[PDB]
């Protein structure tokens, strides 16, 4: 059950589709970025069409919607990465084994400007920076802390009923950490410069 | 899409079901175990009915069946753990970030043994305060595999000029494999828990 906006893959399971500037889908993604990164130049935006990553993500979304007895489990967040990680992420998504002050998971920023720091979106030899727009199953979240290998329990009376994610700040979060494969789908890659 | 031989779970998402000696289901597991741990005795065998683990596992298996086109990608393997880990494995499965370094490391992931005897060592199936040892019987998506190396955080590429097209698992020896290591969530389904004693 692959999404409408996806374009035809001629019976293939993975492609990167460059968005046409000026069109509905490109503008939507551009505006999410420019909210905090308007001083940056966008070279291009690619839609990640990864059927396998999508199916595994969607199964986890349906599980979490049942578990939490609501939708509102999903947020659109940013992830800056070096150019040499881009192919792996395109194919395999986010892997916690590859500063973890709020725990040993994969980090995602509320604001593109946070992910646009050179420490995350490392400029390549040409000054090209890379940032993903990511669907993340943040679900029910709590404040994290160093050393977590999974999120904490909602009640230590029930040690295996866990929060879905952890944050820096529960009232006003600026980052989310997830600890399980297939809790994040890389949806768009932004290639840009300072 | 839950298997039809499972107990009705009454909209419950998780259940441990105690098997009866004399059932084929019990005897096949007991024989797979006593093959290499005839010196131990089984207290009980529980089938693990975890709907979410099952669904995510079967999705990964369908993907590996399509990707590798005509394979036996699945093996039935053993995993000894301590009693404190059993609640978490039962609900959430096998988490590489919780994994013990193995005495012979072929990568930083979750280890599964071909032989019950390996998993029966106190170093994995640690006796609890009552002398109970715990070992899972696990469907593991071993797929296409190679000899691993202590440094691995993911399985290696099949081809060094295409670094993202990976082996599915690694092993100690490709000709006589006696353990497997997997580096991803939902690549292992814990099907049965054997509680045993000396
Ligand atoms: C590892 O990568 C990141 C880490 C991020 O927070 C790391 C952090 C930890 C503790 C305090 C603060 Br303040 C920030 C945010 C975004 C990315 C990213 N790739 O976009």
From Swiss-Prot, chain A:
* Compartments in which it is found: Nucleus
The signal sequence is: none
Question: Can you give the residue ranges of the PARP catalytic domain?
Answer: 2-194
Q: Which domain of life is it from?
A: Eukaryota
Q: What does this protein do?
A: Mono-ADP-ribosyltransferase that mediates mono-ADP-ribosylation of target proteins. Acts as a negative regulator of transcription.
Q: Please state which protein family the record places this protein in.
A: Belongs to the ARTD/PARP family.
Tell me what this protein is called: Protein mono-ADP-ribosyltransferase PARP15
Q: Which organism is it from?
A: Homo sapiens (Human)
This protein's encoding gene: PARP15
Please specify the portion of the entire protein covered by the chain, as first and last position out of its full length: 481 to 678 of 678
């Amino acid at each position: 059950n692959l999404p409408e906006h996806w374009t035809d893959m001629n019976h293939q399971l993975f492609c990167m589709v460059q968005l046409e500037p000026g069109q509905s889908e490109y503008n939507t993604i551009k505006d999410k970025f420019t909210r905090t990164c308007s001083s940056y130049a966008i070279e291009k935006i690619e839609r990640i069409q990864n059927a396998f990553l999508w199916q595994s993500y969607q199964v986890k979304k349906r599980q979490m919607d049942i578990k939490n007895d609501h939708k509102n489990n999903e947020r659109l967040l940013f992830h800056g990465t070096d150019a040499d990680s881009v192919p792996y992420v395109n194919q395999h998504g986010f892997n916690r084994s590859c500063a973890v002050s709020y725990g040993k998971g994969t980090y995602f920023a509320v604001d593109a400007s946070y992910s646009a720091k050179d420490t995350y979106s490392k400029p390549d030899s040409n000054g090209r920076k890379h940032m993903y727009v990511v669907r993340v199953l943040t679900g029910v979240f709590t404040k994290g802390r160093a050393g977590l290998v999974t999120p904490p329990p909602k009640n230590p009376h029930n040690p295996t009923d866990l929060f879905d994610s952890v944050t820096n700040n529960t009232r006003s979060p600026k980052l989310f950490v997830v600890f399980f494969d297939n809790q994040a789908y890389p949806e768009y890659l932004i290639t840009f410069t300072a």
